């Protein structure tokens, strides 16, 4: 009984720690993705991870990198505690049904179940996080929120409670793409290395193939993550639909635009997952005692 509570608590705390550390990368990712959208811009102003971060620090200030952070922490507590903490339980449920799918298929189906539930519960916090990360006093549309709790109050009043779930469907599509692509690519890359005797079947080969899988999952996620960030950030009526947003991005900016923010997106995915997994294991083990 108590180990489930330890699993949930450990996943929540470990996700909060990883989110705090990675969060400047998230703001750089979002600002690179929204940068293409920004109307009437005469030139780009964010390029590179460190160039974006330094531009924001110099003009807007260091706290602006964090600007969405309380909604990030709320996302880690509500969404990531359920997503990561319940994974073992759902994989156990599927292992009791182990005739129904391969081990890879069971890992995928547990990931898709817990990720879908966690994305649905998470979505208000992502709408607030993204809107606060994208907004600037020196770009685009005027800032409309004085931080996280004001963002919730204003979105819920202006757009209704339904409005806080804006962009659920691209976020589901992104999380499905991440989970499927990362699991498939990891197992295929491990097979490729070991079966051809390219690397020893030991922790180095697993870490290398996990890096390759996490990159490929970020790459596949990226078009959907750009359209997600733009659709979530957009005031009402700017995009008639999510496919309208994707069509506009492709039509004016072209196919390179969908990848915008790819490098900070990958760096955050990898660094967040590493810090989260290390802290989750260490805290789960220590608290279990």
């Amino acid at each position: 009984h108590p180990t489930l509570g330890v699993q949930l608590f450990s996943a929540g705390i470990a996700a909060c720690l990883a989110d705090v550390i990675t969060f400047p990368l998230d703001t750089a990712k979002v600002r690179l993705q929204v940068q293409g959208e920004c109307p009437t811009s005469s030139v780009i102003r964010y390029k590179g991870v460190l160039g974006t971060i330094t531009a924001v620090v110099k003009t807007e200030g260091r706290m602006k990198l964090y600007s969405g952070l309380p909604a990030g922490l709320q996302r880690q507590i509500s969404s990531a505690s359920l997503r990561i903490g319940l994974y073992d339980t759902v994989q156990e449920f599927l292992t009791a049904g182990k005739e129904t799918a391969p081990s890879l298929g069971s890992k995928i189906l547990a990931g898709l179940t817990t990720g879908g539930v966690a994305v649905f519960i998470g979505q208000p916090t992502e709408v607030v996080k993204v809107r606060l990360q994208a907004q600037s006093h020196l770009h685009g549309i005027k800032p409309r929120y004085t931080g996280t709790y004001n963002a919730y109050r204003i979105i819920a009043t202006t757009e209704g409670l339904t409005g806080l779930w804006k962009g659920t469907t691209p976020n589901l599509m992104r999380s499905v793409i991440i989970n499927c692509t990362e699991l498939v690519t990891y197992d295929l890359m491990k097979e490729a290395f070991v079966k051809n005797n390219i690397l020893a079947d030991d922790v180095p080969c697993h870490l290398v193939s996990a890096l390759i899988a996490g990159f490929c999952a970020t790459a596949m996620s990226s078009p959907v993550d750009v359209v997600k960030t733009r659709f979530i950030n957009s005031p009402p009526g700017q995009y008639k639909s999510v496919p309208n947003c994707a069509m506009k991005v492709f039509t004016n900016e072209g196919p390179t635009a969908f990848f915008k923010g790819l490098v900070p997106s990958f760096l955050r995915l990898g660094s967040w997952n590493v810090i989260m997994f290390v802290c989750f294991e260490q805290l789960k083990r220590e608290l279990s005692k």
Partner: nanobody, 127 residues
Framework: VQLVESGGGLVQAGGSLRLSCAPS????????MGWFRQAPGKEREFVAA???????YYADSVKGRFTISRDNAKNTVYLQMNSLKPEDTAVYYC??????????????????????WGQGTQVTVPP
């Protein structure tokens, strides 16, 4: 960690033998296990290894003739030796290595990569 080899002995050419390695103490199922042999007056040579994931590796001199296997429930490693030849006469040593020490397949053949070693068992194949 203490390693105890067993199953050695004298066998005619073309015969078969099965070696066993039993680790004692703070042994983890995550340890890579390897087998080495040293003929009289010769240097210690690699024979076979099995990763913690169960992937077997074999020296070219024993490829297709020897089969390494692992029983994780008993933490025991076995080396099935078939089609033995006089040149296989040597003392066989069991070795264990902590996880993460092997990057390339060639790393399994490096004696310095193993943290624990057994006392060895003599295998003799008369001409």
């Amino acid at each position: 960690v203490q390693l105890v080899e067993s199953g050695g002995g004298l066998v005619q050419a073309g015969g078969s033998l099965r070696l066993s390695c039993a680790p004692s103490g703070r042994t983890s199922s995550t340890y890579t296990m390897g087998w080495f042999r040293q003929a009289p007056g010769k240097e210690r040579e690699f024979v076979a290894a099995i990763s913690w994931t169960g992937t077997p590796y074999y020296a070219d001199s024993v490829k297709g003739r020897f089969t390494i296997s692992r029983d994780n429930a008993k933490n025991t490693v076995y080396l099935q030796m078939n089609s033995l030849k006089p040149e296989d006469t040597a003392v066989y040593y069991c070795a264990a290595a902590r996880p993460g020490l092997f990057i390339f397949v060639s790393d399994y053949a490096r004696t310095a990569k193993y943290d624990y070693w057994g006392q060895g068992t003599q295998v003799t194949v008369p001409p």
